[PDB]
């Protein structure tokens with residue numbers, strides 16, 4: 001497990017999307033786009049395409065110490081997201097968890113059934129039609 | 141540089157390319173020898189060859205025949221040069237270390253793959269479902285497993301294995317079909333039974349109620365046309381066959397049914413994570429394809445769990461290929477491939493390098 005923790009932690013270093021993540025209190029958002037973790041522009045934070053999957057890292061101060069950083073890592077699955085997108089969001093959520101030393105607590109969020117913890121991140125939560133096309137090649 | 145995804149099971153090979161949404165090659169994991177041929181052409185030459193299964197209950201046991209399976213997969217089916225493709229393979233839970241190392245050696249020394257990885261089948265299935273936490277029920281043609289997984293990490297001490305799966309149900313359906321007077325004996329007739337099983341069987345919500353209904357009325361009966369034109373009629377055999385999964389005694393097996401192994405697996409995990417597992421039972425494998433099996437599993441797990449426990453059985457429509465699809469997704473990720481054994485690394489470390497790279 002210590003060797004498994006080392007191998008997984010090393011692999012997490014090869015994802016540019018995690019560089020700078022979890023540095024300060026706030027909400028950071030990425031979208032899965034044809035298997036790639038793409039940061040969502042701040043002006044779009046809180047808006048989620050029904051056809052897509054996302055990763056939302058909430059960094060906050062825990063009740064046990066106001067000068068420390070704690071992490072809730074949610075991945076959000078749109079009602080019309082494709083399997084490649086949801087599966088990549090799931091795996092990359094574990095990867096970001098590894099990248100941050102296992103500290104984050106993982107939450108699976110689906111459109112319309114989101115936890116209150118997730119809903120409390122936005123004053124502000126708008127579902128948009130459409131989404132980026134799947135990364136899958138369809139086998140005829 | 142497309143990556144190959146090969147999912148080897150006791151009955152079926154599932155092979156294709158990372159990034160595809162389905163395996164391009166699906167063929168029987170069967171090898172015939174002249175008194176070599178693989179898959180369908182082995183079965184066409186049944187009259188002159190002897191056929192064998194190189195994988196038993198999800199474990200490779202005939203390596204010479206497995207080598208034939210992989211060579212057929214690369215050269216005859218996918219028609220790829222294996223030296224040009226990083227290759228992801230799958231293994232049963234708790235696969236012994238010696239089997240992993242010889243899989244590694246064959247891939248690098250015989251097939252000269254540039255990179256290789258062997259992954260946990262149930263973990264691929266869970267990612268394929270969009271989950272990092274859950275308990276996978278994987279039932280194929282040879283073996284059935286329960287594998288609970290938390291935040292991406294399998295819990296090996298809670299894993300359950302049940303040596304009862306699709307081939308046993310095919311044989312059982314063949315047996316009970318004799319009651320009405322039918323006789324399926326030849327392997328050609330046995331494959332017809334497997335087809336009857338996959339098309340007309342279903343899991344009863346209440347088994348004793350349905351038995352009484354099949355004796356009361358003929359409304360549960362279905363007809364089936366054989367290739368030679370003969371039309372047979374089936375009744376309570378439709379649900380008696382998959383009932384064995386919940387009642388292994390139907391074939392003389394002294395074993396808990398798949399509902400109890402699921403519950404038993406959950407109870408072996410820490411208390412604080414059981415509620416997440418109860419709400420995320422993910423079914424995978426062809427033998428979980430019976431209509432009604434999810435609602436039946438929901439009923440049985442409910443009767444075993446505390447009354448307030450929220451329980452959820454997830455049954456993805458394409459769960460016959462969820463293992464493969466999870467492999468196709470993960471192999472499409474550069475950080476996952478970053479962990480794969482390279483040919484260079486194997487040339488200096490040998491087959492023991494799987495214990496340090498493949499989790």
Ligand SMILES: Nc1ncnc2c1ncn2[C@@H]1O[C@H](COP(=O)(O)OP(=O)(O)OP(=O)(O)O)[C@@H](O)[C@H]1O
Nearest residue numbers: 149150151152280281282283306338425426427429
């Ligand atoms: N619709 C269906 N209904 C019932 N059984 C089915 C259906 N589809 C497939 N099966 C059964 O699923 C089994 C093969 O599934 P799968 O490919 O998951 O197993 P495998 O990986 O070859 O075997 P194992 O996982 O046991 O090593 C066969 O027994 C087949 O008859």
Ligand SMILES: [Ca+2]
Nearest residue numbers: 051052131132
């Ligand atoms: Ca999409």
Ligand SMILES: [Ca+2]
Nearest residue numbers: 097102103104
């Ligand atoms: Ca964690």
Ligand SMILES: [Ca+2]
Nearest residue numbers: 148149150280
């Ligand atoms: Ca299998």
Ligand code: NA
Nearest residue numbers: 165166167168
């Ligand atoms: Na085929």
